[PDB]
DNA sequence: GCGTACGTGCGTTTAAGCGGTGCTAGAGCTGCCTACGACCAATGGAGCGGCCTCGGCACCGGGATCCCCCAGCCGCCGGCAGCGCAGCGCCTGACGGG
């Protein structure tokens, strides 16, 4: 269900692990179930520390 | 280099701590009865294997942003150098005193 919504955003009809890793990581609750599992070819969540960004 | 706030110390003070009750709740165990899960023999069809064909995605090529950059550009202002000047203390007059 969470994965399917992600596939909608990228518009691909076929579900893909990149969706799966993305889906199960945004939900903080489901995150706790798999806090020590790594998905094949999952890729990290898109995140950047604010300080790294330019001052303005 | 600044400065505050947290360590050190002192002086209350109070609730922890001790020792003492007194209770019954609840855990531990036993006796005994039941049902429910394992076991066994059959059965078929759900699932798994083997093909096998379209199109979702990949890939390309092109056009479309769009942030990223920065000199242009001006405003601003303050510093700065020059200029006009305001005030004062002395300089020096006006006029009586020495």
Give, in Å, how far the C1' of B13 lies from the CA of A47: 56
CA distance A52 to A36: 27
CA distance A38 to A34: 8
Nearest nt to the A54 alpha carbon by C1': B68
Give, in Å, how far the C1' of B38 lies from the CA of A12: 50
Looking up tokens 């993305």 gives A22
Chain B positions with an atom below 7 A of a protein C-beta are 56-58
Q: What are the residues whose beta carbons fall under 8 Å from the beta carbon of A17, sequence distance 6 or more? A: A39, A40, A41, A42
CB under 7 Å from strand B: A 12-14
Q: By the 8 A CB rule, do A31 and A25 touch?
A: yes
């Amino acid at each position: 269900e969470l994965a399917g919504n992600a596939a909608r955003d990228n518009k691909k009809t076929r579900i893909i692990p990149r969706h799966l890793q993305l889906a199960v990581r945004n939900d903080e609750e489901l995150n706790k179930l798999l806090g020590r599992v790594t998905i094949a070819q999952g890729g990290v969540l898109p995140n950047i520390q604010s300080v790294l960004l330019p001052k303005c």
